[PDB]
Design a protein around this ligand. Structure first.
Ligand SMILES: CCCCCCCCCCCCCCCCCC(=O)OC[C@H](COP(=O)([O-])OCC(O)COP(=O)([O-])OC[C@@H](COC(=O)CCCCCCCCCCCCCCCCC)OC(=O)CCCCCCCCCCCCCCCCC)OC(=O)CCCCCCCCCCCCCCCCC
Ligand code: BCL
Ligand code: BCL
Ligand SMILES: CC[C@H]1c2cc3[nH]c4c(c3C)C(=O)[C@H](C(=O)OC)c4c3nc(cc4[nH]c(cc(n2)[C@@H]1C)c(C(C)=O)c4C)[C@@H](C)[C@@H]3CCC(=O)OC/C=C(\C)CCC[C@@H](C)CCC[C@H](C)CCCC(C)C
Ligand SMILES: CC[C@H]1c2cc3[nH]c4c(c3C)C(=O)[C@H](C(=O)OC)c4c3nc(cc4[nH]c(cc(n2)[C@@H]1C)c(C(C)=O)c4C)[C@@H](C)[C@@H]3CCC(=O)OC/C=C(\C)CCC[C@H](C)CCC[C@H](C)CCCC(C)C
Ligand SMILES: COC1=C(OC)C(=O)C(C/C=C(\C)CC/C=C(\C)CC/C=C(\C)CC/C=C(\C)CC/C=C(\C)CC/C=C(\C)CC/C=C(\C)CC/C=C(\C)CC/C=C(\C)CCC=C(C)C)=C(C)C1=O
Ligand SMILES: COC1=C(OC)C(=O)C(C/C=C(\C)CC/C=C(\C)CC/C=C(\C)CC/C=C(\C)CC/C=C(\C)CC/C=C(\C)CC/C=C(\C)CC/C=C(\C)CC/C=C(\C)CCC=C(C)C)=C(C)C1=O
Ligand SMILES: COC(C)(C)C(=O)C/C=C(\C)CC/C=C(\C)CC/C=C(\C)CCCC/C(C)=C/CC[C@H](C)CC/C=C(\C)CCC=C(C)C
Ligand SMILES: CCCCCCCCCCCC[N+](C)(C)[O-]
Ligand SMILES: CCCCCCCCCCCC[N+](C)(C)[O-]
Ligand SMILES: CCCCCCCCCCCC[N+](C)(C)[O-]
Ligand SMILES: CCCCCCCCCCCC[N+](C)(C)[O-]
Ligand SMILES: [Fe+3]
Lengths: 240, 281, 302
């Protein structure tokens, strides 16, 4: 009957749909590889989808996926076993090298632009008409690392103009240079800003930005990467 | 075996239990100590379930059903064929679930991300525990739990419901449903919003978040924003399930009568209780 | 403890954002509204502006007419007494015409006519608002996802109070406007058709509802888990994969064996939610037109 028809029909629809859904999520990081980077033998039942090309605004060109994949940065890792499936140990300083939970991707070295073609993110000093409207203004508060030692002082807030949001705290270190600190990895308190991931001694290692009034996708990744990695690698310096 | 960008992430560490012992992968999958735990609990449980199936004398999945002990057994142990098997199976499920959560924690650490996912999952686990542990205890027999079978479980739902009248009147049930509906609404929108920006009209350039915020203020005069909608989703979801637990944990424990009748409180407020006319006067 | 990013710990404000100006008729957009610092702790603090236009007004006017046409009926039931009105608010009900009138538009007002008026108002209200979702997108050059997603919802509503009442031969088969009454109608609709738990569309529909919660839980917690690497900035992540997208995909690959991309995850999303009322609509449509009792149907399968 009709009902039987409809339901049998639907289970068929649903199956080609999953198939679709699945092949679309195969647009990045495919095809699969062996730990040595050579193409892996068994890529699953699903074919790579036919490529699609994105037209990036503000004449930043195009992106076609799937496409040639490459890390475009050295990886300082060495195998710890003779068969597949085991960890790869950092061969240096994982933090300094950017592997592990400290990994960063070679994103473009251009900043994210808003709808108008202006830098999406800005130090608040250069963002005409922005102010802390609620909560504790961090600016001026010392910054404490997981080792409970003071590392610097907030000397500005880098805001996201189109979404009117605090993205990073800029921090002034003992030598007078500054670093960005992701907003998402610090606790703003009444008398201090506490950073659990990094011990005071690692703040200097936080990668620097080439221009003082801009951050690029590459530098966001290298920074967030680094600060995140502290959680696992600063661990010996963290006390509470 | 690895995604084109996976290797630099596959470093040692992050394990909660047992150091480097189980710190490794199997194909795409991460094992970890709890990798093993869940496997063991999952193996055992499925076994017991098959064992129930022979005692039942059917291999047909639409028929197979593992029932809790009958009320006469209260919160004591029961013979295998008479409810023990379900009790173990329930222990094993719990073991599986919790372990699966703790593995999520272990992966979280290795990758250096937040614990929001293990977190949210614990709500699912807590809803399940409400229906097979917290409610039966409080009620006083494993027998109030739902049976493990594809349709028999739908039956428990239907019977348990109709016991208190039309269950629609359970007030926390009303609230819990509003989230389920609301969440789906919001998942519908979020998905649609991002896709429409990433896949504009033919030959046009990718839109920006600015467009997303504009599209919505134009539409309903407000936009919760890209960070917001993700906070929103997590919340509606967790809330739906939170109220779902609540509506059950109260049902049969502190309220055992017809749910519709509980509304008489409102209608019988002394200031309008006796005023004639309307529906109730 | 570590910061979780469920609530902002510092609010920043700037000049009211009047938004992108594509092909949008700027004469129609309103003025910026105030800013809720309340809202600001969760998401955006800025209210408005909003776009009026012709369809917005028609929609918005029919919308109120519907609501009010029901409202006066409730008052008439309450004996115009504000006390009764409050006491009995969820008990009042605007019911469709009796089965006697069939698909007739001649039912007396106290006997079903008023229901038709209200519905007519809702019909126009809803469709115009649909056209509104479409146009608003067109004017910004965006995909029409939202309008199509919306159409799914519309499907179930169309079926409940219009398509099914018409295929059954009478308006009496439609849903009454009322809080407790539309609950009862639902509960009763299942009883009559032999328990909707045997309607496999109903069962499918529940799977996608349950799933929507499962997914929006998964997606939300994930994006929050990696917002420490600017995860929420999904459009740029699509355009240039960040570590965020990577950690996201990998956490999931390592847990359950496969994974999404940032554009990908949102396709899972729109389809999981859209299938709820899509399947739903179908389950209800066959109910009572082709299948009288899902249990009997369940025994044979035809
Ligand atoms: C009876 C039911 C009737 C009830 C009415 C309710 C209908 C509600 C449907 C809502 C659909 C939501 C979809 C969301 C979406 O993608 O929208 C954007 C999508 C693109 O938007 P755009 O702005 O035009 O383009 C922007 C970009 O250029 C392009 O942007 P893009 O890349 O994002 O869009 C590409 C998109 C294009 O999307 C579509 O083309 C949409 C397809 C609509 C399908 C409708 C489902 C009907 C359910 C049938 C169930 C059977 C039961 C009987 O790709 C897909 O999503 C492909 C879907 C894959 C389907 C798999 C089919 C398998 C067939 C079986 C094969 C055998 C299997 C082997 C075994 O919109 C549409 O294409 C419109 C579809 C409208 C049709 C409505 C039906 C009319 C009646
Ligand atoms: C929480 C609310 C009620 C209840 C009310 C209902 C109602 C009402 C319905 C279901 C439906 C289903 N229920 Mg139930 N269900 C409950 C508790 C459970 C439990 C549990 C351990 O707590 C589980 C595992 C299930 C599982 C299921 C599926 C068989 C089915 C589709 C659900 C779905 O899409 O979810 C979304 C999740 C996903 C898409 C992720 C993938 C889920 C897959 C499908 C899981 C299948 C597991 C199953 C085959 C058993 C495996 C166990 C062993 C390892 C073999 N229910 C409680 C008692 N359930 C629907 C149905 O059609 O089944 C008859 C239906 O109509
Ligand atoms: C006793 C009750 C019966 C039963 C009878 C029914 C009936 C009858 C129906 C459902 C339906 C549904 N049931 Mg059932 N159901 C039962 C038990 C259950 C259980 C359970 C036991 O755990 C669950 C989980 C469900 C779950 C569900 C949903 C999956 C499904 C509706 C999805 C939806 O989101 O629509 C919500 C979305 C809409 C209604 C879309 C409307 C969109 C419109 C356009 C909104 C306009 C707004 C308006 C103009 C006002 C404006 C707003 C103001 C400005 C604020 N049922 C039992 C067996 N169920 C529906 C279905 O699809 O079944 C197959 C349905 O018709
Ligand atoms: C795919 C399935 C899900 C879905 C999707 C969906 N719904 C949608 C969309 C989509 C994709 C839209 O684009 C569209 C939308 O614009 O949302 C922002 C819509 C929408 N879904 C809505 C509601 C809705 N969707 C629902 C369900 C669902 N929608 C599904 C679960 C439900 C239910 C019953 O679960 C409801 C109630 C609307 C918010 C919106 C469609 C708006 C519309 O058509 O308006 C027409 C008429 C008016 C303008 C009426 C206004 C009259 C009011 C002023 C009266 C009430 C006054 C009241 C006392 C006010 C106070 C409220 C307080 C909280 C402050
Ligand atoms: C809290 C909000 C919602 C939510 C969230 C949620 N679910 C989650 C997560 C999150 C955040 C995960 O991270 C985790 C996941 O990895 O998803 C891919 C998970 C998950 N949610 C799942 C299912 C699921 N979630 C559901 C619900 C929900 N999940 C909510 C609505 C439902 C239902 C019925 O609504 C189901 C069916 C899994 C796909 C996955 C967890 C997988 C897992 O725990 O693996 C460990 C266990 C096994 C491999 C099998 C164990 C076998 C048992 C020992 C025996 C079988 C016993 C069982 C009781 C029989 C039941 C029979 C039925 C017919 C009744
Ligand atoms: C870019 O822009 C944006 C998006 O992106 C695309 C969006 O998606 C959206 C769209 C999102 C929305 C419209 C979501 C808005 C959310 C809501 C209106 C909330 C949803 C939830 C509800 C309606 C449920 C309300 C329930 C409440 C308040 C209950 C509170 C708690 C209690 C009463 C206590 C419980 C205790 C009980 C019952 C005790 C019982 C005792 C005995 C039985 C005894 C918007 C607006 C947006 O702007
Ligand atoms: C933006 O970012 C995001 C991503 O990517 C960038 C993502 O991918 C995802 C994840 C989401 C998707 C890929 C979309 C599709 C997902 C769903 C519809 C959810 C439903 C899921 C399932 C049905 C799969 C359930 C599968 C499970 C639990 C695992 C299957 C497992 C097995 C067969 C074996 C289980 C493992 C065992 C026994 C232990 C380990 C193994 C040993 C041998 C030991 C999200 C949410 C996301 O937000
Ligand atoms: C404060 O008092 C005043 C008077 C000021 C008020 O305004 C108060 C007002 C309230 C008390 C209002 C309360 C309103 C509610 C309780 C409403 C509840 C509504 C629901 C629960 C609705 C549920 C389901 C509705 C459904 C499925 C409607 C479907 C409608 C349609 C598909 C429309 C079909 C079209 C029809 C039959 C006519 C078509 C005619 C043509 C010519 C095309
Ligand atoms: C996480 C534990 C879940 C267990 C589910 C039910 C187990 C019942 C345990 C009772 C065993 C014996 N008793 C009555 C003497 O306590
Ligand atoms: C978006 C893809 C995920 C879809 C989930 C498919 C599994 C649902 C199984 C429901 C069982 C249903 N049925 C028809 C017997 O009632
Ligand atoms: C519904 C769950 C689907 C998970 C898919 C997992 C893909 C695994 C690919 C094969 C890897 C094989 N193995 C375990 C033999 O090494
Ligand atoms: C109801 C949800 C079911 C999810 C559908 C299962 C998809 C499995 C995809 C496995 C992909 C294998 N691969 C390529 C990663 O090895
Ligand atoms: Fe998202």
């Amino acid at each position: 009957d009709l009902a039987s028809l409809a339901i049998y029909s639907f289970w068929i629809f649903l199956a080609g749909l999953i198939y679709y859904l699945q092949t679309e999520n195969m647009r990045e990081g495919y095809p699969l590889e062996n730990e040595d980077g050579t193409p892996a033998a068994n890529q699953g039942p699903f074919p790579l989808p036919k490529p699609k090309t994105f037209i990036l605004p503000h004449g930043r060109g195009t992106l076609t996926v799937p496409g040639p994949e490459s890390e475009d940065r050295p990886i300082a890792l060495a195998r710890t076993a003779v068969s597949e499936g085991f960890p790869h140990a950092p061969t240096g300083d994982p933090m300094k090298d950017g592997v592990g939970p400290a990994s960063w991707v070679a994103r473009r070295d251009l900043p994210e632009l808003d709808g108008h073609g202006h830098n999406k993110i800005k130090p608040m000093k250069a963002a005409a008409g922005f102010h802390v409207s609620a909560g504790k203004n961090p600016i001026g508060l010392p910054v404490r690392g997981c080792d409970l030692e003071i590392a610097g002082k907030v000397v500005d807030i880098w805001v996201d103009i189109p979404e009117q949001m605090a993205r990073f705290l800029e921090v002034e270190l003992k030598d007078g240079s500054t670093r960005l600190l992701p907003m998402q990895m610090v606790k703003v308190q009444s008398n201090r800003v506490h950073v659990n991931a990094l011990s005071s001694d690692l703040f200097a290692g936080i990668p620097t930005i080439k221009s003082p009034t801009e951050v690029t996708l590459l530098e966001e990744d290298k920074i967030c990467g680094y600060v995140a990695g502290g959680l696992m690698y600063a661990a010996p310096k963290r006390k509470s | 075996a690895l995604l084109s960008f996976e290797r630099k992430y596959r470093v040692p560490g992050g394990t909660l239990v047992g150091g480097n012992l189980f710190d490794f992968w199997v194909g795409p999958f991460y094992v970890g100590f709890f990798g093993v735990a869940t496997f063991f609990f999952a193996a055992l449980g499925i076994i017991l379930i098959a064992w129930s199936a022979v005692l039942q004398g059917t291999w047909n999945p639409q028929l197979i059903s593992v029932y809790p002990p009958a009320l006469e057994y209260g919160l004591g142990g029961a013979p295998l064929a008479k409810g023990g098997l379900w009790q173990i199976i329930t222990i094993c499920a719990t073991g599986a679930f919790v372990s699966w959560a703790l593995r999520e924690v272990e992966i979280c650490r290795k990758l250096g991300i937040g614990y929001h996912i293990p977190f949210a999952f614990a709500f699912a686990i807590l809803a399940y525990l409400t229906l097979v542990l917290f409610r039966p205890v409080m009620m006083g027999a494993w027998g109030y739990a739902f049976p493990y079978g594809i349709w028999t479980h739908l039956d428990w739902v239907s019977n348990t419901g109709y016991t208190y009248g039309n269950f629609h009147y359970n007030p926390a049930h009303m609230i819990a449903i509003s989230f389920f509906f609301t969440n789906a609404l919001a998942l519908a929108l979020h998905g649609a919003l991002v896709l429409s920006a990433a896949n504009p009209e033919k030959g046009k350039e990718m839109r920006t978040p600015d467009h997303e915020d504009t599209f919505f203020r134009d539409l309903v005069g407000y936009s919760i924003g890209t960070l917001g909608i993700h906070r929103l989703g997590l919340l509606l979801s967790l809330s739906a399930v939170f109220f779902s637990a609540l509506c059950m944990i109260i049902t049969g424990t502190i309220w055992f009568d017809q749910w519709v009748d509980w509304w008489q409180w409102w209608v019988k407020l002394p200031w309008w209780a006796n005023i004639p006319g309307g529906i109730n006067g | 403890a570590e910061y979780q990013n469920i609530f902002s710990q510092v609010q920043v404000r700037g000049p009211a954002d009047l938004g992108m100006t594509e092909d949008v008729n700027l004469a129609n957009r309103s003025g910026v509204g105030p800013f809720s610092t309340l809202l600001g702790w969760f998401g955006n603090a800025q209210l408005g502006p909003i776009y009026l236009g012709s369809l917005g007004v028609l929609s918005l006017f029919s919308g109120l007419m519907w609501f009010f046409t029901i409202g006066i009926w409730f008052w008439y039931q309450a004996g115009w007494n504000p006390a009764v009105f409050l006491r009995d608010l969820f008990f009042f009900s605007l019911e469709p015409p009796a089965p006697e009138y069939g698909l007739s538009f001649a039912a007396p007002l106290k006997e079903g006519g008023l229901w038709l008026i209200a519905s007519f108002f809702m019909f126009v209200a809803v469709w115009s608002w649909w056209g509104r979702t479409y146009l608003r997108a067109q004017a910004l050059g965006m995909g029409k996802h939202t309008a199509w997603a919306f159409l799914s919802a519309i499907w179930l509503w169309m079926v409940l109070g219009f398509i099914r009442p018409i295929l059954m031969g009478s308006w009496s088969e439609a849903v009454p406007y009322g809080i407790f009454s539309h609950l009862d109608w639902t509960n009763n609709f299942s009883l009559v058709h032999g328990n909707l738990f045997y309607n496999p569309f109903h069962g499918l529909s529940i799977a996608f509802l349950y799933g929507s919660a499962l997914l929006f839980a998964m997606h939300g917690a994930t994006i929050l888990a990696v917002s420490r690497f600017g995860g929420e900035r999904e459009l740029e992540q699509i355009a240039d994969r960040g570590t965020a997208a990577e950690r996201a995909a990998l956490f999931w690959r390592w847990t359950m064996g496969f994974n999404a991309t940032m554009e990908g995850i949102h396709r899972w999303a729109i389809w999981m939610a859209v299938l709820v009322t899509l399947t739903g609509g179908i389950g209800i449509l066959l109910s009572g037109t082709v299948v009288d009792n899902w249990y009997v149907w369940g025994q044979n399968h035809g």
